Structure formats: C-alpha cells, structure tokens
C-alpha cells in the first residue's frame, strides 16, 4: 500500500507552482491528487516549497500537535501555502472548493527512519 510519507506528498506537496494562480486551483488539485475519489475531503492544505525544505521541518521546533501528540514540528520560516475549503455548492462527486493563498508557518507530524512528515497538522 501507499506509505504514509508518500500519501503526505500526494495530499500536501505542490513544488511545481509558487502559489495558487486562480480560484480554480483547489478544484483542480483536489481532483487530480485523488482526494475526492471516495468523498469530498472538506479541508486540505498544499505547500508550495521544495520537498527537502518541508522534510527539514522534522528537525525544527518540536511542538504538541492539536490532538496532544508530541511528534509535531513547526517550521522556523513561513512557507507558501494554499488552503482549500469545501463550499456550500459542493456535492459529491462534484466537489467544490474555495482557494485561499497564504504565507504561514506549518506544523507537521513526523514518523519513521528517515524521519519524515506524515500528517499536516496546522498552519499558524
């Protein structure tokens, strides 16, 4: 099966663009990354940075995750992110999202060896 690390890349990484360029970014990306296959995932965040810079966050500031776990890490720097949130007209299989572009610190949970991001916790 797909590894947790691979799933994080699929769900959260977009190193191919620097920022969302149009209001349709989330509709396109949620569909193309197969996040709407079974149901409309209600919220998702894409990170517009190199995979290496995001993996490096697992060696930065240790913080508690929202759910209390202590394998979360906050990035020292802000990063380019896109927030995707389901709209009121969203109806499976035609899932619909609002695109919001922002520059925030990210918080990820890390696991494994190599120690890599496997869950996106929050942006602050």
């Amino acid at each position: 099966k797909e590894t947790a690390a691979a799933k994080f890349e699929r769900q959260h990484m977009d190193s191919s663009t620097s920022a969302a360029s149009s209001s349709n970014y989330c509709n396109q990306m949620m569909k193309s990354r197969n996040l709407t296959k079974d149901r409309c995932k209600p919220v998702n965040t894409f990170v517009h940075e190199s995979l290496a810079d995001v993996q490096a966050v697992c060696s930065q500031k240790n913080v508690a995750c929202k759910n209390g776990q202590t394998n979360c890490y906050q990035s020292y720097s802000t990063m380019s992110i896109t927030d995707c949130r389901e709209t009121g007209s969203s109806k499976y299989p035609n899932c619909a999202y609002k695109t919001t572009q922002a520059n925030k610190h990210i918080i990820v949970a890390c696991e494994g060896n190599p120690y890599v991001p496997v869950h996106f916790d929050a942006s602050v």
Side-chain angles (χ1 to χ4, degrees):
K1 283 150 66 173
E2 185 183 37
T3 65
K7 178 174 175 195
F8 177 94
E9 192 185 355
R10 182 172 54 85
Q11 293 196 133
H12 299 297
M13 290 300 309
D14 183 12
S15 312
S16 295
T17 64
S18 298
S21 55
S22 82
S23 64
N24 273 313
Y25 174 90
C26 285
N27 291 337
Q28 288 168 344
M29 291 291 292
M30 294 294 287
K31 176 177 180 54
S32 66
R33 296 293 184 87
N34 293 321
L35 308 179
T36 60
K37 182 185 163 281
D38 291 307
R39 68 183 183 104
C40 306
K41 185 178 181 199
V43 191
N44 191 54
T45 300
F46 292 99
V47 183
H48 304 275
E49 301 295 345
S50 72
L51 180 58
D53 284 347
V54 174
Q55 289 166 338
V57 174
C58 297
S59 67
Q60 294 179 16
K61 181 56 170 179
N62 188 210
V63 297
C65 313
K66 282 181 180 164
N67 80 332
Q69 289 174 207
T70 51
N71 64 319
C72 275
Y73 295 84
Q74 184 180 302
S75 64
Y76 294 135
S77 317
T78 58
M79 293 187 174
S80 173
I81 66 167
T82 302
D83 277 325
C84 303
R85 184 155 292 95
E86 196 176 19
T87 68
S89 297
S90 183
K91 186 178 195 299
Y92 185 87
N94 303 125
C95 305
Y97 296 89
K98 172 186 174 183
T99 301
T100 304
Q101 175 61 40
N103 260 81
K104 292 188 169 187
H105 306 262
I106 66 167
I107 302 173
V108 298
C110 302
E111 302 182 359
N113 169 78
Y115 197 57
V116 294
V118 298
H119 155 85
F120 191 96
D121 206 49
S123 63
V124 297

